[PDB]
């Protein structure tokens, strides 16, 4: 009875909509809560195994389901779930429903609107990492499907980052947004729009100055390197901003910045590198003489990289005078055996590259 099956689909949608969720008392309506869980599982297996089970009437009820069971104001961040299984079932149900080939984005474009996207985005600040992962996947699918909403999504994410970097400096979902944005970047057109350049300069670069760079550092580095791959021209400003945003007090942040500049130099172009050696190597000479052994080890691993050697040997005359004083002073004073060996190896390479 396929028509009856779809009507029972709608009825179970209504049942899962009403207050039979795990949020309510598990003991009260316990059979109801359990049959709600089993109903979500049955819905998922039904829409997986069966085909052509998505009709125009279906979309509003599932959208209302997602809004009711998910679109709520985030709980207070008392930190300086019992209902989680049902919520996770809702997440995976919605995810597969989007993944359904029978899904038609044009049909759902009325049901999924800018308000829906905005409430989904504000959900991203949830403390649960699993919640953030599911939301990340959901937003990625939505952005992939809906072409029209993409500009609004980008603008709303830009607003979220502006509030984060300038007003609140407290957002748990930064990493997920960053990786989604990187996925978007990979598909950017070769001539970058002025909106994209403004996004890079005014948003991502200020992310570095944010105190909690550690939690979202790899994703930010990936986005930056993706832009640098997209356009070589944008490399020159960004690195100086990197120098401008360089921290003078936190050694671990210095290690993180090293990492980023290492990837940048891995993807750098010689024409930009000849422009940007002097401040970069000034900061690097400060770092090699920095008392912290980890930053020193990272800056010495810089010499281990082949591409960095090649680029430095390309223009020895400018780099060498900056490196010589810090290298000589570090030659005079050294404590750790590993750092001593690394600095001496760097001295040997510097003697080889020029005398």
């Amino acid at each position: 009875p396929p028509a009856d099956q779809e009507k029972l689909f709608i009825q179970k949608l209504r049942q899962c909509c009403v207050l039979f969720d795990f949020v309510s008392d598990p003991l009260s309506d316990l059979k109801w809560k359990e049959v709600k869980r089993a109903a979500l599982s049955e819905m998922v297996e039904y829409i997986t195994h069966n085909r052509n089970v998505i009709t125009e009437p279906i979309y509003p009820e599932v959208v209302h389901m997602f809004a009711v069971n998910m679109f709520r104001t985030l709980p207070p961040s008392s930190n300086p779930e019992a209902a989680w299984p049902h919520l996770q079932l809702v997440y995976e149900f919605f995810l597969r429903f989007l993944e359904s080939p029978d899904f038609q984005p044009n049909i759902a474009k009325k049901y999924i609107d800018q308000k829906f996207v905005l409430q989904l985005l504000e959900l991203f600040d949830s403390e649960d990492p699993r919640e953030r992962d599911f939301l990340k996947t959901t937003l990625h699918r939505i952005y992939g499907k809906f072409l029209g909403l993409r500009a609004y999504i980008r603008k709303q994410i830009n607003n979220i980052f502006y509030r984060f970097i300038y007003e609140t400096e407290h957002h748990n979902g930064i990493a997920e947004l960053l990786e989604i944005l990187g996925s978007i970047i990979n598909g950017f057109a070769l001539p970058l729009k002025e909106e994209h350049k403004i996004f890079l300069l005014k948003v991502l670069l200020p992310l570095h100055k944010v105190k909690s760079l550690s939690v979202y550092h790899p994703q930010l580095a990936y986005c930056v390197v993706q832009f640098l791959e997209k356009d070589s021209t944008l490399t020159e400003p960004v690195v100086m901003a990197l120098l401008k945003y360089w921290p003078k007090t936190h050694s671990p942040k210095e290690v993180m910045f090293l990492n980023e500049l290492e990837e940048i130099l891995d993807v750098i172009e010689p024409s930009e590198f000849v422009k940007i050696m002097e401040p970069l190597f000034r900061q690097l000479a400060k770092c090699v003489s920095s008392p912290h052994f980890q930053v020193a080890e990272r800056a010495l691993y810089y010499w281990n990289n082949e591409y960095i050697m090649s680029l430095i040997s390309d223009n020895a005359a400018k780099i060498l005078p900056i490196m010589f004083p810090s290298l000589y002073r570090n030659s005079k004073t050294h404590w750790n055996k590993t750092i001593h060996g690394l600095i001496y190896n760097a001295l040997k390479l510097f003697m080889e590259m020029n005398q």
């Binding site: 050694s251 052994f293 750790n336």
Partner: protein, 288 residues
């Protein structure tokens, strides 16, 4: 003179670190003091012995609130002051300031963490570089750690050390013959003393800690009877109760860092020996 030391102690009491010149002056005076006493620094009853503060400065403040403040309370410390660098510099400075200010009232032993390599590994050197930039503070405190006494003899009847018994040594005269002014290796009687642990299995056993030698109950018993030791006290091993008894109640382990790493939630304990050398234990939770 002593006025500067008192002002420095008050500064540290306000959770404010001292300057490089003050640090080096304190290290020099502390070295002068430490050169005087023997490896087995005898201590007279009464005294309060604590476990491993492990750099939680505010936990040390709670400890002083619970047991009194120097010089009102004679304090004996097992060691391991340098640890995860939350506020390890502050507590190390405070202890050395107390020691220089009150040579008799405060006695501090050398924990196995008190080595240059261990300080660098556990971030204490990183904490020094974060706080001061210059590595000179770390060098001065490492040099001071070289002078720290290895063991303590409370009233001649109780033996105290950060680790445990060493197979190479059966008499206190052996430790007295040892030289403490050197970097502690991963071997030798000094490292065995610093890293040993009490174990139920009889006899000397290879330590799973990576250094020292685990010893049986009969090992501790025969050591005590040979050296006339009423009791053996130690640290470096956690107790959820804060204080543990083992080896026929001849070995007692004391830990003084409550909720070590702020995640374990273990209670901390301190052992006070009164005038009549009667031990008692007092337990406390981490400060808010």
């Amino acid at each position: 003179f002593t006025k500067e030391l008192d002002q420095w102690i008050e500064q540290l009491n306000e959770c404010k670190q001292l300057s490089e010149s003050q640090v080096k002056s304190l290290c020099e005076k502390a070295k002068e003091i430490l050169t005087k006493e023997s490896n087995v620094q005898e201590v007279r009853c009464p005294v309060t012995v604590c476990g491993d503060v492990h750099g939680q400065f505010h936990d040390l403040m709670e400890l002083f609130r619970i047991g009194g403040k120097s010089p009102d309370t004679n304090y004996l410390f097992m060691g391991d002051y340098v640890d995860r660098g939350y506020y390890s510099v502050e507590t190390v400075t405070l202890l050395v300031a107390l020691k220089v200010r009150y040579r008799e009232r405060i006695t501090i032993l050398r924990g196995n963490h008190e080595s240059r390599q261990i300080t660098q590994v556990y971030g204490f050197y990183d904490e020094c570089l974060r706080k001061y930039g210059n590595a000179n503070v770390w060098k001065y405190f490492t040099d001071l750690f070289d002078y720290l006494p290895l063991t303590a003899l409370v009233d001649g009847q109780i033996f105290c050390l950060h680790g445990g018994l060493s197979p190479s040594i059966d008499t206190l005269d052996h430790i007295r013959a040892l030289d403490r002014l050197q970097e502690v290796p991963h071997e030798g009687p000094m490292c065995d003393l610093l890293w040993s642990d009490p174990d139920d299995r009889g006899g000397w056993g290879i330590s799973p800690r990576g250094a020292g030698y685990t010893f049986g109950q009969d090992i501790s018993e025969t050591f005590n009877h040979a050296n006339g030791l009423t009791l053996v006290s130690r640290a470096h091993q956690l107790v959820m109760e804060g204080y543990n008894w083992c080896h026929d109640r001849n070995v007692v382990t004391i830990f003084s860092a409550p909720n070590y790493c702020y995640r374990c939630g273990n209670q901390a304990a301190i052992m006070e020996l009164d005038d009549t050398l009667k031990y008692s234990f007092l337990q406390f939770d981490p400060a808010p």
